[PDB]
Amino acid sequence: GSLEPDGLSYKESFIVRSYEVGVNKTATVETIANLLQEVGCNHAQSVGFSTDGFATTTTMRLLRLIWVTARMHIEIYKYPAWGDVVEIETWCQEDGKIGTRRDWIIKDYSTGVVIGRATSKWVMMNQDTRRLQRVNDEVREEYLIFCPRTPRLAFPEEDSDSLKKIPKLEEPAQSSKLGLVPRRADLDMNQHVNNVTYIGWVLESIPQEIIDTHELQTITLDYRRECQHDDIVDSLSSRECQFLHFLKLSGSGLEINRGRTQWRRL
Amino acid sequence: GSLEPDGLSYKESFIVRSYEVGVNKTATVETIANLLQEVGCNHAQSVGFSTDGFATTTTMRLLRLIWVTARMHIEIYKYPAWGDVVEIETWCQEDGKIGTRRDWIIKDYSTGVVIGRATSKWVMMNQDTRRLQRVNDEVREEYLIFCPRTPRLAFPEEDSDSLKKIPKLEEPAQSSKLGLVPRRADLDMNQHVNNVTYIGWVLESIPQEIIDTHELQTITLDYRRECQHDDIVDSLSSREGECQFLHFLKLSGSGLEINRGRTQWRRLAK
Ligand SMILES: Cc1ccsc1C1=NO[C@@]2(CCN(Cc3c(F)cccc3F)C2=O)C1
Ligand SMILES: Cc1ccsc1C1=NO[C@@]2(CCN(Cc3c(F)cccc3F)C2=O)C1
């Protein structure tokens, strides 16, 4: 991968691997999420920010601040097959004083056709208090200098599904997987359940009949809390075809995340 | 990747990704196993065998025969870091009347140094009866044409750890992770727990104190049974600047053996 000529976006290509495809003989949602993370990490490295998954500047590390996910939204028009080459372009934009947006466009490298797009909201959190913390414009300029000046939106449409609020589904959920436990292999380099594990947990709540007849066009997650190594999680869904999702701690009922998935017939 | 000029081995390169590394800031055992599977599958495709995970010839499909894993052995000298390019060469050999061997050599592409190696034993099973089978000469000839005539060994040493028998550890096990359940994400394209999931389950049984101070140099798994979507598994280990563990994967209800293993560990000094 490489910064673009203007230095305000980053591009990387991948050849889809046989083990990265699922039941529909195309790349899994988890593979797509992993590729989005990979090009984002290579972009952070290329502009001199942390590569630890907090993507920090010098001054954020001084101020005990880290970037954390508020929302992730992925839309897939066509899943690539084993051996397909995909090119992902990614860039960041200001999202108010508290936040940044990271966007991605996924192309079939051979045709140049857009096969998917994604957007994410990040907020600045004090690592000691877990509170959102605003910093002055001079700290923000450290990262805003690596973002396009003129807005580039992967989701330029007026009332984008990517910004649509997710309500809390009412129990009992129509579909549920109770008592899910993270594995060592599910933990990031900070002992928190990684994003691909949340995606897997969300998909566990989908009825098999849907998995057998449909594929996922969009997934939206709003994150509230991290899941710890010893946490036990219930993954719930109901129809809102479209589903609402809710991930909650088995004991307390405390919200981990909520989500929306949209499905298209195979 | 690509067949080599002589058409008797296959080579593929990979750039290690940020998400493929674990606590030691180098590629996980799971990533290595995935790369070994990937170059094996690309090789099968390049010689016109099935890519469904059974690597069948024309005559095997006629006879309702599939390759299944009896043993997998991985040895890692050095795990590659994020951004390292690794090149894996793989090839197959006849393994007596009982089956075939697939071997791999893993090189750091930058230096050309061997950083690891792997071997696997496969046996022929009738996919309807689950009964093992000695290989017909018709099936033998269909694959032997794609194998070196003089055997190449990734493990050419005398009394290789790769061929060492694994005993059944005695219960109670020193260390255990009970009631492991496969996820949809852990299923192969035939609804069976995939190989990387077994490796992960084996490593769940290792004490955290070992994970914190050592890294894995070798893993050996002997496979007995496939784990189904609704199966619940217990992962057991006991001890057997170096340390070794016996492993046993068994069904929670019946106690039936899924697989057994051995892992060998090396102390990290930094
Ligand atoms: C994709 C990913 C995985 C872990 S954190 C994360 C992030 N995605 O978006 C963020 C928000 C700010 N930022 C820094 C940053 C710029 F602000 C501008 C240009 C390059 C650059 F790295 C990010 O990378 C965090
Ligand atoms: C690596 C892997 C993942 C799923 S099944 C599998 C196999 N690895 O070894 C086997 C044994 C036979 N065989 C066919 C074969 C040759 F016999 C010779 C040359 C190329 C070639 F594909 C294999 O690939 C099965």
The domain ranges of chain A are: 2-163, 175-265
> Measuring CA to CA, how many Å separate B45 from each of A18, A90, A95, A263, B143?
11, 33, 47, 32, 13
This PDB structure is determined at a resolution in Å of 2.0
Which of A19, A82, A194 minimises the CB distance to B37?
A: A19
What's the CATH architecture for A175-265?
Roll (3.10)
Give the closest of A17, A28, A200 to B38, CB-based.
A17
Using CA atoms, how far apart are residues A88 and B201, in angstroms rounded to an integer? 33
Give the whole-angstrom CA distance, residue B182 versus residue B196: 12
Q: Please report which helix (H) or strand (E) contains residue A156, including its range.
A: none
Residues with Cβ within 8 Å of residue A114, at least 6 apart in sequence: A77, A105, A106, A107
Q: Name the token pair of A182.
A: 């993270």
- Using CA atoms of B131, B136, B142, B145 in order, give the dihedral in degrees to the nearest 10: 110
In degrees, to the nearest 5, what angle opens at C-alpha B77 toward C-alphas A16 and B45? 30
CA nearest to B167, candidates B77, B76, B244, B265? B244
Q: Which two tokens stand for residue B127?
A: 């996919």
Q: Is the CB of B102 under 6 A from ligand 2?
A: yes
What tokens were used for B165?
Answer: 């028998």
Within a 13 Å sphere around the CA of B185, how many CA atoms are in the beta-carbon half? Answer: 17
Burial class of residue B159 in the structure, from the number of CB atoms within 10 Å of its CB (0-12 exposed, 13-18 middle, 19+ buried): exposed
- DSSP class of A163: G
User: Which of B67, B71, B41 has the alpha carbon at shortest distance from B219?
Assistant: B71
The hierarchical CATH code for the domain B175-267 is 3.10.129.10
Residue A246 Cα to ligand 1 midpoint, Å, equals 26
- Compare CB distances from A51 to B18, B38, B194 and report the shortest one's residue: B18
Atom of ligand 2 nearest to the CA of B102: 9
Question: To test ligand 1's pocket by mutation, which of A41, A102, A104 has the most ligand atoms within 8 angstroms of CB?
Answer: A102
Distance from CA of A22 to the nearest CA of B (A): 7
**CB contact (8 A) between residue B38 and residue A19:** yes
Please list every residue in chain A whose beta carbon sits closer than 8 Å to the beta carbon of residue B204: 183-185
Query: Ligand 1 mean position to A38 CA, how many Å?
Result: 11
Catalytic positions of A, written as ranges:
190, 192, 227
Task: Kindly name the residue from B195, B214, B227, B259 that is annotated as catalytic.
Answer: B227
Residues A181 and B248: their CA atoms lie apart, in Å, by 21
Which conformational region is residue B55 in: left (phi greater than 0), alpha (psi within -120 to 50 degrees), or beta? left
Q: Is the peptide bond before A182 cis (omega within 30 degrees of 0)?
A: no
Q: Using the structure block, give the residue that is written with the tokens 């750039």.
A: B15
Distance, CA of B62 to CA of B154 (rounded, Å): 32
Residue A19: phi and psi, rounded to 5, are -80, -10
Residue B201: CB within 6 Å of ligand 2?
no
CATH 3.10.129.10 applies to domain A2-163: yes
Method used experimentally: X-ray
Asked if A86 contacts A115 with a C-beta cutoff of 8 angstroms, the reply is yes
Ligand 1 atom at shortest distance from the alpha carbon of A37: 1
Torsion of CA B224, B228, B234, B239, to 10 degrees: 30
Distance from CA of B137 to the nearest CA of A (A): 30
Q: Please tell me the residue having the least CA distance from ligand 1 atom 8.
A: A102
> Residue A62 and residue A138: Cα distance in Å, rounded?
14
DSSP secondary structure letter of residue B20: G
CA distance A178 to A232: 9
Among the bound ligands, the one closest to the CA of A35? 1
Ligand 2 atom nearest residue B54's Cα: 5
CA A169 to chain centre: 21
* Whether the domain at A2-163 and the domain at A175-265 fall into the same CATH topology: yes
Instruction: Find out whether B27 and B80 touch, Cβ atoms under 8 Å.
Output: yes
Which residues in chain B (7-36) have CB-CB distances under 8 A to chain A? Answer: 17-19, 22-23, 28, 30, 34
Paired tokens of A25: 């003989």
- For the record, the structure tokens of B36 come out as 């070994």
- DSSP per-residue string spanning B174-227: SEEEEEE---GGGB-TTSBB-HHHHHHHHHHTS-HHHHHHEEEEEEEEEE--PP
**How many residue pairs from chains A and B have C-beta atoms closer than 8 A?**
58
Length, in residues, of chain A:
266
Is A183 in Cβ contact with B200 (below 8 Å)? yes
Residue B10 CB partners (closer than 8 Å, separation 6+): B1, B2, B3, B4, B39, B42, B43, B46, B89, B90, B91
B55 near B49, Cβ under 8 Å? yes
Name the strands in the sheet holding A242-249, side by side, starting at the edge strand that comes first in the sequence: A2-3, A10-15, A85-95, A99-108, A114-126, A65-76, A214-223, A255-265, A242-249, A233-239, A175-180
DSSP three-state, residue A22 = coil
Cross-chain residue pair B30–A185, CB shorter than 8 Å: yes
**Which residues are within 8 A (CB) of A257 and not within 5 positions of it... i.e. 6 or more apart?**
A198, A202, A221, A222, A223, A224, A225, A245, A246, A247
Other CB atoms within a 10 A radius of the CB of residue B173 amount to: 19
The runs of H, that is alpha helices, within chain A are 29-46, 58-62, 137-144, 195-204, 208-213
Distance CA A64, CA A54 (A): 11
**Which tokens belong to A159?**
């009332």
Give the tokens for residue B146.
């794609």
User: Which residue type is seen at B9?
Assistant: S
Nearest protein Cα to ligand 1, atom 9? A102
Alpha helices in A147-234 (DSSP H): 195-204, 208-213
- Please check whether residue A164 is in contact with residue A218, taking contact to mean a CB–CB distance below 8 angstroms: no
Which residue puts its alpha carbon closest to atom 19 of ligand 1?
A: A146
A12, two tokens: 């990387």
Show which of residues 95-154 on chain A sit within 8 Å of chain B, judged by CB atoms.
none
Let me know: does B97 contact B106? Beta carbons within 8 Å.
Answer: no
Are A140 and A117 within 8 A, CB to CB? no
- The structure tokens listed for A4 are 């673009």
User: Which string of DSSP letters, residue by residue, matches B166-179?
Assistant: -PPPPSSPSEEEEE
